[model samples]
Every structure is written in C-alpha cells, then in structure tokens.
Target: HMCDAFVGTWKLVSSENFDDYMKEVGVGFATRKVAGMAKPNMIISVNGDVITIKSESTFKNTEISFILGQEFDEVTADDRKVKSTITLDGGVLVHVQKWDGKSTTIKRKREDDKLVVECVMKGVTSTRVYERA
Candidate 1:
C-alpha cells in the first residue's frame, strides 16, 4: 500500500495557523487553547487491509482504523461525530471527514525527512510538521 511509507511513529515539531483551523471547524475557545498547545505523536501501522493511525498527546488521544476507500464513523478530537474516509492519492494520504453538512480535508505526506500534515476546513488551512520518533 502507499501507506507503507507512513508506517512509523512521528512527533509533531511545528504547527502553523492551527488555531484558525480549529475555529473554522467549530471548536470552542477553550478547546482550541488547549489543543493548540498540544504536541502529539502520530503512530501509523497496518495489518492486512486495515490501517490504523493514532494521535497521542497529554491532552487527548484519537485513533482511526479503516480500510482504504471505505467510510467509517469517527469521533474527532473536537468531539464531532463525522463520517470519514482515507485514500492514497499521488503517494499522499488524503483523509476526508463530513458532518452536519460541513467537511474537512487532511493530507499527509512524507517530505524530505519529515512528515507534513496539511489540515483544511472552511477555507482555513493549517500545516503541522512532524519528525520521526
């Protein structure tokens, strides 16, 4: 699978415009404040056709296990119940979540020696870079 390159433990190094992205996604002020300050570790692994990605942090932990091209129900960190799907597109992991007539897209790609995550919601974009840990 194209996700093979992403199977590893990655620690967040930097984030840009995350607060704005959170706000655009309807996250509350207090949640954004704490979430913006959290540096999470992303753990990616695959078993057969199931791919699991876990986000671990002092504030909260979220995990998703799914097969490519399949839709699954997900409870986002901001507590939104959304339908989500992930696909490999041009060697990048493209994840989409939809709820309440709103949607968001997240792209993850390996760039140089780092893992870069691009989050988009309501025209707001946030970039988070992670280093292998």
Candidate 2:
C-alpha cells in the first residue's frame, strides 16, 4: 500500500479563486463559467507504480494515468493539450502541466480527513477542499 494515501474517492467540499485560476490558464470565459459551477468528485487508484485519477462532475469528467516522475501528454478538462508530470514530494502530490509556453501546478495532500488541493497558474492560486466519500 505504498503511495496509497490518496487511493480513494473524494468529493469537493469547497473551492476558492478557481475562476481566476482557469482564466490564467487560458480557459474561455464561457467555459470558465461552466467549469466554475462544477463540483467534481475525484477518484484515485494505484496499481504498482501507476496511478489513475478520475474527475467526475455534472459538466465534465477527465481521467489521467501516469507513473511517478514520468512525463506524458494530457488533454486537460478545459481542453488544453499539455505535457504533464506527477511526483510526490514530502507527502504532497505535485502535478505539473505545461502547454503553449504556459504552465500550471496542482498540489494535493491529505490533511486530517480531508483532501486539500492547491491549483496555481501564473499569479493566481485556487484552493479546493475535498472530503472522502
């Protein structure tokens, strides 16, 4: 059960500054409006060194699978094609995505019984809190 800390379903409980983060990441105004209204549940699973994360919501669903320290092509929920990498650092899951010379980083960590996610793009940052479901 190594790298198993996040292997569970989590429901979004709260979000802050997500719209600004989406805007900084180049999401269209209309798409941002729709995405901002979404409350996604994240499902994480681990198989050996591979990890899969699935996001399910009313508006959209996205799934990504990757191994730690390896980079892969990714189509984001907002429809951006990017090079993505996931790594674990000091108990935090760090996910980085780069596209069109722009980059974003997301950090997810379990705090107490909640999953706290911090999304960053340019100077904007969004915090999303999730509870296990």
What is the TM-score (0 to 1) of candidate 2? 0.97
Would you list the clashing residue pairs of candidate 2? none
RMSD of each: 0.8, 0.8
Can you give the lDDT of residue 35 in candidate 2?
A: 88
Task: List TM-scores for all candidates, in order.
Answer: 0.97, 0.97
The Cα local distance difference test for each model comes to: 0.94, 0.93
Model 2 whole-model lDDT (C-alpha atoms): 0.93
Error of 2 at 2 (Å): 3.1
TM-score of 1: 0.97
Please estimate how well model 1 matches the true structure, expressed as its whole-model Cα lDDT. Answer: 0.94
lDDT by residue (tens digit), candidate 2, 69-99: 9999999888999999999999999999998
Candidate 1 on 1-133: residue-level lDDT in tens?
5578899999999999999999899999999999889999999999999999999998899999999999999998889999999999999999999999999999999999999999999789999999999
